[PDB]
Amino acid sequence: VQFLQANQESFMGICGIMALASAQMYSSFEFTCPCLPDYNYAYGIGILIVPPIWFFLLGYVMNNNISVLTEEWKRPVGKDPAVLRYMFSSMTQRALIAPAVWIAVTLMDGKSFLCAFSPTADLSEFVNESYQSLSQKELLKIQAKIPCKDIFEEHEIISREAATRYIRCLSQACGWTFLMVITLVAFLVRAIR
Amino acid sequence: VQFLQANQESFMGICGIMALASAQMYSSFEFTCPCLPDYNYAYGIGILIVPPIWFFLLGYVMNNNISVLTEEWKRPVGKDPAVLRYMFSSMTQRALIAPAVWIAVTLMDGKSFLCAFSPTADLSEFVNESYQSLSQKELLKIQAKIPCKDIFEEHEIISREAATRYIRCLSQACGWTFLMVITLVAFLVRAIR
Amino acid sequence: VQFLQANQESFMGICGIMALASAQMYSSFEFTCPCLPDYNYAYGIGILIVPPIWFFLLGYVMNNNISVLTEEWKRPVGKDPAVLRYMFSSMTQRALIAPAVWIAVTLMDGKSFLCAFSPTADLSEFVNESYQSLSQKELLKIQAKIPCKDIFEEHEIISREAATRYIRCLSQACGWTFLMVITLVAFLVRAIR
Amino acid sequence: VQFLQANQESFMGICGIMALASAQMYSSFEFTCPCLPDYNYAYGIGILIVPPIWFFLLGYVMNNNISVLTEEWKRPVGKDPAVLRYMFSSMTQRALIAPAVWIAVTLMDGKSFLCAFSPTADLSEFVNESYQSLSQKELLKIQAKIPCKDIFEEHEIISREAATRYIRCLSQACGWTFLMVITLVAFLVRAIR
Amino acid sequence: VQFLQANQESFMGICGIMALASAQMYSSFEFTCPCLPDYNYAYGIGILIVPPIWFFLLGYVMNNNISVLTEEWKRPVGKDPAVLRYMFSSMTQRALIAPAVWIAVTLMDGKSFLCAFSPTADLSEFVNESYQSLSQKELLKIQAKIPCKDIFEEHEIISREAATRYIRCLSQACGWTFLMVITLVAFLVRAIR
Amino acid sequence: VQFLQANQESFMGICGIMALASAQMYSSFEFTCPCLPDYNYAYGIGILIVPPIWFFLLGYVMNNNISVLTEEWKRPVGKDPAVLRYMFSSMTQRALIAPAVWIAVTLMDGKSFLCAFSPTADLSEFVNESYQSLSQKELLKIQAKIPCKDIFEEHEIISREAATRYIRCLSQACGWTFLMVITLVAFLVRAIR
Amino acid sequence: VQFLQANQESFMGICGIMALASAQMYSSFEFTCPCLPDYNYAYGIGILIVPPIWFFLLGYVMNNNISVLTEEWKRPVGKDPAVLRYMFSSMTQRALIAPAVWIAVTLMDGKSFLCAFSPTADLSEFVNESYQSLSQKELLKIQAKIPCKDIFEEHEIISREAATRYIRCLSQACGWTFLMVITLVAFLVRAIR
Ligand SMILES: *[C@@H]1O[C@H](CO)[C@@H](O)[C@H](O)[C@H]1NC(C)=O
Ligand SMILES: *[C@@H]1O[C@H](CO)[C@@H](O)[C@H](O)[C@H]1NC(C)=O
Ligand SMILES: *[C@@H]1O[C@H](CO)[C@@H](O)[C@H](O)[C@H]1NC(C)=O
Ligand SMILES: *[C@@H]1O[C@H](CO)[C@@H](O)[C@H](O)[C@H]1NC(C)=O
Ligand SMILES: *[C@@H]1O[C@H](CO)[C@@H](O)[C@H](O)[C@H]1NC(C)=O
Ligand SMILES: *[C@@H]1O[C@H](CO)[C@@H](O)[C@H](O)[C@H]1NC(C)=O
Ligand SMILES: *[C@@H]1O[C@H](CO)[C@@H](O)[C@H](O)[C@H]1NC(C)=O
């Protein structure tokens, strides 16, 4: 939370104020994995996918030049040819910021990955040597409870903390690759056009 | 609480100051489920319904142009035809902000859902296999105590934490659908009129 | 306490500065129920009643136009007829704010209700089935100790937490009804006069 | 401590800055009852009495018009008759603020009352039924240790927490009566002169 | 620490900024009594005596008019007779502030008194009745360890907390007498010269 | 986190604002060593290497003179000869700040060193005397779990805390050498060119 | 950390901003004694010696008049004779501030002394009476672990807390002597030149 208060007053700005808004909203959001073999994937991917869509729509709405764009696109011939495209692309670029920040933040803190890819993941290195031959339905039901400290009661079968750290490392690697690709794309866009 | 201090000074504004007011008021509100089979639904739905109504009335009151609206609507013919409707609709739109923020915040933190829909919910996956045949009145009385950590003393029958996470996920899904529908409506309103 | 720091700088104001003053004073006030069958009601109703009276007097005192009102009311004929009534009613309205805030805050946090109406309340649903036939003097003395966690040592007779939550819900319902009635009255006053 | 930071910037002032100074000084003062039958009363009454005297002297000193008052009172005839009395009374009134704040704060938090009036108080309702006949010297020595959690080791004789709450309620009642009388006096002074 | 942040911005000042500097420096200073019969007195009196001397020297150094004073005192006859004495006395008075604040703060928090006067103090009321006849060298070595919670392991001989509270009360009494005498002297100085 | 809030407002700046950005980002980054003999080195070196590369790219992007550099380098002959090189080198120098801050901070807090060089390190002084003759594959697998408090369960073989402190000291030595070399290079650059 | 935030805004300054920088950097630095008989002295003296050297170099670099000094010292005859020496000495004096602050802070908090002089110190008063005759190599290895709470497991031989307090007192005495000598030197410099 201190990171938001620090990065504040930097723009001082409406463009770079939704970024800290999304970051702080994630910081004050109670992630709760259902820890069920059926609804884990859905919940994880939903937390990963839906809030950025909503932030996109919100950034499109809060821009004071949607009215003019609608008025011009509505006429068969509006009062120029492509200053409209300019402000439209500027609006889209300004809007695309907060979704990227949300996705980066939720990837660096690998809760959604841990909640989503836990039941199906291949954890054969962490499963105990005694219970190394059992129905994968049992392993599904057990591994589903890994992101839940309070519900997991199968310490004699799978080390919970080892698998947690493994999947969190995977999630952080993915987040860093995402950040690098995004920054390269921004570099090309600013250096070409 | 840090989210409110961060989002402050953004408008700097009386319109976008009731939003943080309602958010902070929820943050500093001691939600207390009665954990009784009779008054759970009432308390949950009341916390969900009444404070937004009060915020609506308050936002209507704090606007300095209710006096002029009353004076004009009181005359059979006032000193124009529809600049009154304009300021009235502006007042209503400004007022409708804080109820939406309250409902969104109280849905993302699924306490009201957990308090309200716990006694009647169908929790057959979490009920123990031994006590899978008993009077639904007993299950009513037991499930009523799920939102109360201090009162629940039936660990041999129902896993409390699993059901809590389940209902909290449901509540968060509902909150996200609410936010998306609200944002789409705002988008249409700003893009048409 | 963060709510006061957030709502600060909003008026920026002497009128809307006693509200946060009373709220913060309640936040930093050590409520201590005597937990005796004789002095519970007195203490609860006193905490509910006296501080708003004091805030009323204080708001009357801190207004710089009591001297002029006294000087005019003292003369048999003062130097107009009813600009005095105007400033007097404005002073009274400005003063009536902080008592309302104090009463609302102390009702939402149902300590005074829990301290006051505990010894006399009808708690027959929470009393154990074994001790369901005993002198109501015994129940008086026992229920008096409900708001005190450190003094209550009768867990085999009455569930303390259940009764606490029950009475806190009642208090919050009363507080919400109070807020709604107050806001309706303010609405009528602003819309008529 | 948050109350001081909140009430700050309100005057923005040298008059209403010693009030928060005294309040904060009490907040950051380590009250330590000696818990001995001989020095309890002395310590309690001293903490109640001496700091307000010191604040009075300090408020008299920090006012830049003591030099002129001394120079005029020193002459047999000074260069008017009673503008001196005016500034003297203004200085005295400005000085009398911080002692009142200190006394109110130290009364609302009933430590000085608990430390002072504990050894001599009549606690016959809290003394156990077994030890209801013993030399009042023993009760003196025992009750002296009531404000000390770490020293009290006579739980089989007197309930410490009950007596603590009782005396704290008495102290808060006294503090509220003090505040009411002070505010009434200020009201009369402002409404008459 | 909140007291310093509160008293800040009051002067807004270089004179009244060393006071909060010394107070905060004491607040962030790790007092560590050696708890040995030989070096307790030395450490206590040193913490009481040396830092105020250093603050005196520092306040003398940070004043931009020592160069002129040296240049004038160096000449046999400088370019007036006693405007030098005026600025010298003003410098000395400005410098004497921080030592007083340090001494007051370190007296109100009776650590230095507890560390210094513990081995030699007469604690015959707290010593157990069994060990009331033993070589005062043993009592010296034992009482030396009173300010150290981690080292004291003689609970069967002397109550540590009782003696701690006793000596802390003595220290606070001394601190209050010091503050009163200082304020009286300042009053006389401002009212005479 | 307080260090960032303190060093803020110092530049008041876009150049010296990415430094605190990177420092705060490290402060709010959840380092999680996988504690596996295969992926420890990779994770440690990645955390050490990749974020500074990303900060370099970001500092290159956020500078408003990449467009002009591209436009000039694109032409066979641009509209001078080497004012381009000047602004290019200034941009590169401004960009190189945040990577250095990240590397210094992550070296002073020896987590990456502890995670990376733990499985291969030579810890023969800390290994117990009983298990001083065993397959280095066993020691590899065991030492891999040293940075994980929750996973390490081999206290009868290797002291975890001793090895942790050893490797953290090594990391801090490396960080200090890095800082010294960087500062010497900056000194030469500023004193020559 | 609050001391830095308090002493901030005092200069408001680039000269007196490195002082708080070094103080805060020490506050947010994880001191970790290796607790080995060979590398304790090295680590302690290094933490005491190297960071002030780096702060000296940094303060020399951040001053905007090293370029002019180099340009003038480079010529056989520069465009006056000794205004160069003036700005050079001013730069050196401004640079010497932060090393002094670092050394003072690290001496008042006697970790470096405790880490460095623990293995070689003469602790014959704290060593148990049973183990008062043993090879000083054993005492070396044991005393090396005194600054480490988690590693020290020889409570039957040496009291760890007593020796810790002893060495911390020694370190604080040294720090106070350092501060006094530094202030006297500054006094002489300001009063003579
Ligand atoms: C594996 O299972 C055995 C029981 O067969 C148990 O004793 C052992 O502690 C388990 N180990 C792990 C790492 O789960
Ligand atoms: C279910 O009930 C049995 C008793 O028949 C008990 O042993 C078991 O622990 C219970 N399990 C759960 C998950 O409630
Ligand atoms: C009720 O009293 C019985 C003793 O007759 C006791 O065993 C039981 O735990 C009590 N239950 C409650 C809810 O107080
Ligand atoms: C009163 O004393 C008796 C011993 O006679 C003891 O058993 C009981 O717990 C005591 N009760 C209280 C409230 O002190
Ligand atoms: C005093 O010493 C006796 C042993 O003779 C011990 O039983 C008792 O607890 C001690 N009391 C105190 C207050 O030290
Ligand atoms: C070393 O191993 C032995 C068992 O042979 C055990 O008793 C001892 O505690 C161990 N010591 C350490 C420091 O690991
Ligand atoms: C000293 O060693 C003896 C064993 O000979 C032990 O009983 C005693 O507790 C030890 N005391 C200290 C202070 O180390």
JSON list of C-alpha atoms in Angstrom, two decimals, chain A residues 123-185:
[
{"chain": "A", "resi": 123, "resn": "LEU", "atom": "CA", "xyz": [3.06, -32.54, -8.79]},
{"chain": "A", "resi": 124, "resn": "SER", "atom": "CA", "xyz": [4.85, -35.89, -8.75]},
{"chain": "A", "resi": 125, "resn": "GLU", "atom": "CA", "xyz": [8.02, -34.62, -7.07]},
{"chain": "A", "resi": 126, "resn": "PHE", "atom": "CA", "xyz": [6.15, -33.39, -3.99]},
{"chain": "A", "resi": 127, "resn": "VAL", "atom": "CA", "xyz": [3.76, -36.32, -3.52]},
{"chain": "A", "resi": 128, "resn": "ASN", "atom": "CA", "xyz": [4.96, -38.65, -0.78]},
{"chain": "A", "resi": 129, "resn": "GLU", "atom": "CA", "xyz": [6.63, -41.92, -1.71]},
{"chain": "A", "resi": 130, "resn": "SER", "atom": "CA", "xyz": [4.04, -44.02, 0.13]},
{"chain": "A", "resi": 131, "resn": "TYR", "atom": "CA", "xyz": [1.04, -42.58, -1.73]},
{"chain": "A", "resi": 132, "resn": "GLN", "atom": "CA", "xyz": [2.67, -42.58, -5.17]},
{"chain": "A", "resi": 133, "resn": "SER", "atom": "CA", "xyz": [0.08, -45.02, -6.60]},
{"chain": "A", "resi": 134, "resn": "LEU", "atom": "CA", "xyz": [-3.51, -43.82, -6.25]},
{"chain": "A", "resi": 135, "resn": "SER", "atom": "CA", "xyz": [-6.42, -42.70, -8.40]},
{"chain": "A", "resi": 136, "resn": "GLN", "atom": "CA", "xyz": [-5.77, -39.32, -10.00]},
{"chain": "A", "resi": 137, "resn": "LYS", "atom": "CA", "xyz": [-9.28, -38.37, -8.87]},
{"chain": "A", "resi": 138, "resn": "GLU", "atom": "CA", "xyz": [-8.01, -38.56, -5.29]},
{"chain": "A", "resi": 139, "resn": "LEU", "atom": "CA", "xyz": [-5.01, -36.42, -6.23]},
{"chain": "A", "resi": 140, "resn": "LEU", "atom": "CA", "xyz": [-7.36, -33.97, -7.96]},
{"chain": "A", "resi": 141, "resn": "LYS", "atom": "CA", "xyz": [-9.52, -33.58, -4.85]},
{"chain": "A", "resi": 142, "resn": "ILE", "atom": "CA", "xyz": [-6.46, -33.28, -2.61]},
{"chain": "A", "resi": 143, "resn": "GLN", "atom": "CA", "xyz": [-4.43, -30.86, -4.74]},
{"chain": "A", "resi": 144, "resn": "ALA", "atom": "CA", "xyz": [-7.51, -28.65, -5.08]},
{"chain": "A", "resi": 145, "resn": "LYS", "atom": "CA", "xyz": [-7.08, -27.74, -1.39]},
{"chain": "A", "resi": 146, "resn": "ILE", "atom": "CA", "xyz": [-3.45, -26.59, -1.73]},
{"chain": "A", "resi": 147, "resn": "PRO", "atom": "CA", "xyz": [-4.12, -22.80, -1.89]},
{"chain": "A", "resi": 148, "resn": "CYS", "atom": "CA", "xyz": [-6.18, -23.10, 1.33]},
{"chain": "A", "resi": 149, "resn": "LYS", "atom": "CA", "xyz": [-4.09, -23.29, 4.50]},
{"chain": "A", "resi": 150, "resn": "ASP", "atom": "CA", "xyz": [-7.14, -23.85, 6.71]},
{"chain": "A", "resi": 151, "resn": "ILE", "atom": "CA", "xyz": [-8.68, -26.64, 4.61]},
{"chain": "A", "resi": 152, "resn": "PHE", "atom": "CA", "xyz": [-5.56, -28.65, 3.68]},
{"chain": "A", "resi": 153, "resn": "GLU", "atom": "CA", "xyz": [-5.26, -31.56, 6.12]},
{"chain": "A", "resi": 154, "resn": "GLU", "atom": "CA", "xyz": [-3.28, -34.07, 4.03]},
{"chain": "A", "resi": 155, "resn": "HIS", "atom": "CA", "xyz": [0.26, -33.34, 5.19]},
{"chain": "A", "resi": 156, "resn": "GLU", "atom": "CA", "xyz": [1.10, -37.05, 5.04]},
{"chain": "A", "resi": 157, "resn": "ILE", "atom": "CA", "xyz": [0.63, -37.04, 1.23]},
{"chain": "A", "resi": 158, "resn": "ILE", "atom": "CA", "xyz": [1.78, -33.76, -0.32]},
{"chain": "A", "resi": 159, "resn": "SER", "atom": "CA", "xyz": [4.02, -30.99, 1.00]},
{"chain": "A", "resi": 160, "resn": "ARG", "atom": "CA", "xyz": [1.81, -27.92, 0.63]},
{"chain": "A", "resi": 161, "resn": "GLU", "atom": "CA", "xyz": [4.47, -25.23, 1.01]},
{"chain": "A", "resi": 162, "resn": "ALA", "atom": "CA", "xyz": [6.83, -26.72, -1.58]},
{"chain": "A", "resi": 163, "resn": "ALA", "atom": "CA", "xyz": [4.11, -26.85, -4.23]},
{"chain": "A", "resi": 164, "resn": "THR", "atom": "CA", "xyz": [2.97, -23.35, -3.29]},
{"chain": "A", "resi": 165, "resn": "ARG", "atom": "CA", "xyz": [6.48, -21.95, -3.81]},
{"chain": "A", "resi": 166, "resn": "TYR", "atom": "CA", "xyz": [6.86, -23.86, -7.08]},
{"chain": "A", "resi": 167, "resn": "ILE", "atom": "CA", "xyz": [3.67, -22.49, -8.60]},
{"chain": "A", "resi": 168, "resn": "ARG", "atom": "CA", "xyz": [4.37, -18.98, -7.29]},
{"chain": "A", "resi": 169, "resn": "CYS", "atom": "CA", "xyz": [7.76, -19.04, -9.03]},
{"chain": "A", "resi": 170, "resn": "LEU", "atom": "CA", "xyz": [6.08, -20.11, -12.27]},
{"chain": "A", "resi": 171, "resn": "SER", "atom": "CA", "xyz": [3.58, -17.26, -11.93]},
{"chain": "A", "resi": 172, "resn": "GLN", "atom": "CA", "xyz": [6.32, -14.69, -11.31]},
{"chain": "A", "resi": 173, "resn": "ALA", "atom": "CA", "xyz": [8.26, -15.90, -14.35]},
{"chain": "A", "resi": 174, "resn": "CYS", "atom": "CA", "xyz": [5.13, -15.45, -16.46]},
{"chain": "A", "resi": 175, "resn": "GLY", "atom": "CA", "xyz": [4.58, -11.98, -15.03]},
{"chain": "A", "resi": 176, "resn": "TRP", "atom": "CA", "xyz": [8.12, -10.91, -15.87]},
{"chain": "A", "resi": 177, "resn": "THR", "atom": "CA", "xyz": [7.82, -12.21, -19.43]},
{"chain": "A", "resi": 178, "resn": "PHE", "atom": "CA", "xyz": [4.56, -10.27, -19.76]},
{"chain": "A", "resi": 179, "resn": "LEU", "atom": "CA", "xyz": [6.18, -7.06, -18.51]},
{"chain": "A", "resi": 180, "resn": "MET", "atom": "CA", "xyz": [9.12, -7.46, -20.89]},
{"chain": "A", "resi": 181, "resn": "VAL", "atom": "CA", "xyz": [6.94, -8.07, -23.95]},
{"chain": "A", "resi": 182, "resn": "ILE", "atom": "CA", "xyz": [4.70, -5.11, -23.07]},
{"chain": "A", "resi": 183, "resn": "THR", "atom": "CA", "xyz": [7.68, -2.80, -22.66]},
{"chain": "A", "resi": 184, "resn": "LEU", "atom": "CA", "xyz": [9.22, -3.92, -25.95]},
{"chain": "A", "resi": 185, "resn": "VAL", "atom": "CA", "xyz": [5.93, -3.25, -27.76]}
]
